[PDB]
């Protein structure tokens, strides 16, 4: 066998477990159409958001 | 004079079934699930003897 080195396990001690996760999100709205996320990967920082 | 009053003991018997499933889920959920099916079947049962009697 290949194991689980491969994956993530997080072994559940009830069955129908859930996981959370946070975005920083800008634009007065965390949650609204087009609000954008403060740290994603691909998409760039708005250069100017806090400045001109 | 001395006369007798006599009856056989009669039975009463009652069945769960609690899948191992159900019973893994009653144990995540908080439940003791061994002892829960033993009360239920108790409880319902010592109710009962309470309508006979």
Same mark, same amino acid.
């Given at each position: 066998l290949i194991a689980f080195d491969i994956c993530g396990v997080q072994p559940?001690?009830? %069955?129908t477990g859930q996981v959370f996760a946070l975005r920083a999100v800008y634009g007065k709205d965390p949650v609204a159409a087009g609000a954008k996320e403060a740290?994603? %990967?691909m998409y760039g920082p708005d250069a100017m958001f806090s400045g001109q | 004079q001395i006369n007798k009053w006599q009856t056989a003991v009669k039975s009463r018997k009652l069945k769960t079934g609690i899948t191992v499933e159900l019973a893994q889920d009653l144990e995540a959920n908080g439940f003791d699930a061994p002892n829960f099916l033993e009360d239920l079947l108790a409880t319902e049962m010592a109710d009962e003897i309470n309508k006979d009697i």
């Open positions: 559940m001690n009830s %069955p740290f994603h %990967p | -």
